[PDB]
Amino acid sequence: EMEDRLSSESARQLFLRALRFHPECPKLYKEYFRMELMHAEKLRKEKEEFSEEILKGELAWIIYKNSVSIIKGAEFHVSLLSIAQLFDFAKDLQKEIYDDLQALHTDDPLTWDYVARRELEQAKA
């Protein structure tokens, strides 16, 4: 629907119905999260060629809170961040999710490791 027929709204219903059949599949949540961020890019370029809240990526941010609630996992929350970094727009969305990583997810080794590797990223030696 998206990449061929260019219909964002029809693809949304196919995703939303898919979650009711499979409420616990993380792959469905990540692809749905990615899909809305794709919808934001189409609208940003639409404005350049010629609603503010969606253009900020708020509509994808709703998915993030709900998905974290259903799937209480450290790896899944970090996974949603990876797609978020891939989209250049709305760095606050990447900032918001990253901040929640430390506060919400603690006492688990993976979260502390990710913070360490981010800091990693003759004089140059």
Binding site: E9, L14, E53, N66
Partner: protein, 88 residues
């Protein structure tokens, strides 16, 4: 030849876009998505792809259909360019 009953029948397989209109929202995700959409100007479903049951607001939706129809022309008009470009 005469076929009885005279009333015609809709084809066996609905092509998805007719089906997706029937679905509604019950889970908290679909509530929040729909609420944010309706407070804005963005529509839930496709006007041209999804048919509906056969005044001033109706004219605006007709105008929205024309802009939506104009958009699909633009992306198709855009696509043909690189196809000619890649052919070159």
């Amino acid at each position: 030849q005469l076929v009885f009953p005279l009333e015609k029948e809709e084809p066996a397989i609905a092509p998805i876009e007719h089906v997706l209109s029937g679905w509604k929202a019950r889970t908290p995700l679909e509530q929040e998505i729909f609420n944010l959409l309706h407070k804005n100007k963005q529509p839930v479903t496709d006007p041209l792809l999804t048919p509906v049951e056969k005044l001033e607001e109706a004219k605006m939706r007709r105008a929205e259909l024309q802009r939506a129809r104009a958009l699909q022309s633009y992306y198709e008009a855009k696509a043909r360019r690189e196809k000619k470009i890649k052919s070159k």
